[PDB]
């Protein structure tokens, strides 16, 4: 009985039958006690490596990996509950089993134990542990390829599993820079062509970018964690790709991080090359849409004035009259074009005139074609229509206000539109 | 009917898009070992920039070969409504994707403070446990208890045998 247990608690001695505690009327049943029995040992003995139940968790975990147990998932929920606490002994659950050798034995069992412990775990080691985990992210790489896929979505989970650990790493005052250094390393691995590209858009890589960028924006809006001045951004070559790849979610957190990066920029001197290069990274993205100077710009995230000849010559483009600009503008970017369309009939409701556009892309000729196939009077050009699209896009109608708000932030010419 | 045709369309799309990708890679390889003098495995700083260029070329191809049959529909041939449907599904799924990311971040925070509060609770309970002492006619009383057990057992038995109408719990 529970009440009878309280009286003899100062004089109660515990024999060591571990799993009999763990393995699941006139007098109260035993089942109610065993829930308290686990907490009893946690309070009878202080958290240390010498605790028998803690060693039992390690031993039973190894049984599942080697398939010695009758069924692998019998003790997995029990291990999860016990290993939630004991930061000093939660690391050895991860540190011992984060090696890629255990992954080869069973990749499925490692996933369910990795995802349930990393968010809880706290940074302890000052050094030795970023590289060990970075090896693990490098371990999954050329391992899914060994499995057969360039990026099998065990990596997507493990990228996020260690990403929430970074949230614990950065929220805690100690080793806040350790999470950022790992964050730049993990993002640098995800930007490469082998894992992701425009043609083969397995954008788990880019979603780990923004989920990393969201933490960067959450840390920023205030200067608690400061990135290196020679580095300030994730990387000069790292997230200029994320602007070229027109993923709507990828452009949002990046521009939010660009605002976060800019919020650190004026503190640093303007004569720095990286400051100027990062400045070049905020204009060109804002140039890249709705400026009609992209083809005239000497730098497109590091790109000279070309691309206009060949594919356009293989099959002639039936458009003209600033045909380059609509290849660049936000209403002309194929992924961002329909987001403007979603804004367009929201703007149409705002303007109280409803009419369906011909296509999901908005440009010069299509708007003229949409005109020639019922709408507000006073505007007939695409320049002002894109303005009325962008200001409503600057309202919290879609999560991609971040692109519209960043465009109106720079430059001062675009500031008056907002 | 048309769904099988579309599936084969996307299969050959994957195949020829990827062959286009490695043709671009090996074709700039035909350039880059000749363009400067002999480089092939330099770091991902301009080969990174080469993939940024590749992405820009592909997206320009999209916005060029997209202002097309899409702009002037054939009203019966499905080349452009499929791409539209892909647009709406991606855009609609991304919103809930982002809010799921936010909810996950909030849950991670909540777990952090839960661990903190559990930590100070464990510290206080350890202090309380340390405050307590460590775990470790009597024979006549034991004999009396044994006698009571025997007497109650025998009374219960005999009352059941005789069919007594007032059999009760005896301690």
């Amino acid at each position: 009985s529970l009440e009878q247990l309280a009286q003899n608690w100062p004089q109660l001695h515990i024999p060591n039958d571990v799993d009999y505690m763990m393995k699941p009327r006139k007098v109260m049943s035993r089942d109610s006690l065993k829930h308290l029995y686990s907490s009893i040992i946690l309070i009878k003995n202080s958290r240390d490596e010498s605790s028998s139940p803690y060693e039992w968790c390690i031993w039973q975990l190894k049984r599942c990996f080697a398939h010695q147990i009758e069924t692998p998932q019998e003790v997995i929920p029990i291990i999860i509950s016990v290993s939630s606490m004991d930061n000093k002994l939660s690391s050895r659950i991860i540190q011992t089993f984060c090696n890629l050798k255990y992954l080869k034995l069973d990749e499925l069992t490692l996933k369910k134990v990795c995802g349930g412990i990393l968010p809880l775990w706290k940074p302890e080691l000052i050094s030795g542990t970023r590289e060990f985990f970075v090896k693990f992210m490098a371990s999954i790489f050329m391992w899914s390829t060994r499995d057969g896929h360039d990026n099998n979505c065990t990596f997507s989970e493990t990228c996020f599993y260690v990403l929430q650990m970074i949230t614990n790493w950065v929220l805690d005052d100690k080793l806040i820079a350790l999470g950022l250094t790992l964050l730049h390393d993990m993002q640098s691995l995800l930007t490469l062509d082998k894992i992701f590209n425009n043609a083969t858009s397995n954008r788990f890589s880019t979603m780990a970018f923004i989920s990393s960028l969201d933490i960067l924006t959450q840390l920023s809006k205030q200067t608690k964690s400061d990135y290196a001045i020679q580095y300030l951004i994730v990387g000069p070559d790292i997230m200029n790709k994320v602007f070229s790849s027109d993923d709507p979610l990828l452009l949002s957190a990046a521009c939010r991080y660009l605002v976060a990066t800019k919020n650190k920029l004026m503190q640093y001197p303007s004569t720095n090359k990286f400051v100027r290069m990062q400045n070049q990274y905020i204009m060109d993205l804002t140039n890249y849409l709705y400026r009609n100077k992209v083809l005239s710009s000497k730098s497109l995230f590091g790109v000279s004035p070309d691309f206009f000849k060949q594919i356009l010559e293989n099959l002639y483009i039936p458009t003209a009259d600033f045909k380059n600009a609509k290849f660049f503008t936000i209403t002309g970017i194929p992924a961002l074009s329909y987001i403007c369309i979603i804004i367009l009939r929201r703007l149409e409701t705002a303007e109280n005139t409803k009419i369906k556009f011909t296509s999901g892309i908005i440009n010069e000729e299509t708007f003229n074609n949409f005109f020639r196939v019922g709408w507000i009077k006073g505007v007939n050009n695409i320049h002002d229509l894109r303005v009325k699209i962008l200001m409503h896009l600057s309202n919290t109608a879609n999560p991609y206000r971040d692109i519209a708000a960043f465009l109106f932030t720079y430059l001062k010419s675009l500031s008056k539109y907002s | 009917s048309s769904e099988k045709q579309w599936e084969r369309i996307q299969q050959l799309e994957k195949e020829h898009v990827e062959v286009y990708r490695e043709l671009l890679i090996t074709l700039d390889r035909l350039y880059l070992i000749r363009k400067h003098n002999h480089a092939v495995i330099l770091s991902h700083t301009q080969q990174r920039l080469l993939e940024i260029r590749h992405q820009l070329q592909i997206n320009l191809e999209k916005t060029a070969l997209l202002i097309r049959l899409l702009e002037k529909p054939d009203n019966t041939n499905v080349l452009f409504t499929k791409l539209q449907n892909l647009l709406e599904e991606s855009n609609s799924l991304d919103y809930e994707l982002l809010q799921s990311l936010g909810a996950q971040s909030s849950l991670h925070k909540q777990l952090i403070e839960s661990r903190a509060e559990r930590d100070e609770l464990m510290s206080k309970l350890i202090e309380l446990s340390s405050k307590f002492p460590k775990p470790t006619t009597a024979g006549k009383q034991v004999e009396v208890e044994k006698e009571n057990e025997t007497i109650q057992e025998l009374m219960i038995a005999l009352q059941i045998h005789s069919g007594y109408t007032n059999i009760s719990y005896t301690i």
């Binding site: 590289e131 970075v134 490098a138 790489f141 050329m142 390829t145 250094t181 730049h184 390393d185 640098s188 691995l189 490469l192 082998k194 894992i195 290196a228 580095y231 990387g235 790292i238 | 495995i41 770091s43 991902h44 990174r48």
Partner: peptide, 15 residues
């Protein structure tokens, strides 16, 4: 920090 990024890039090159 950048050394780890370069190491990862080289590893991806080898893969």
């Amino acid at each position: 920090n950048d050394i780890t990024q370069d190491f990862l890039n080289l590893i991806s090159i080898s893969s």
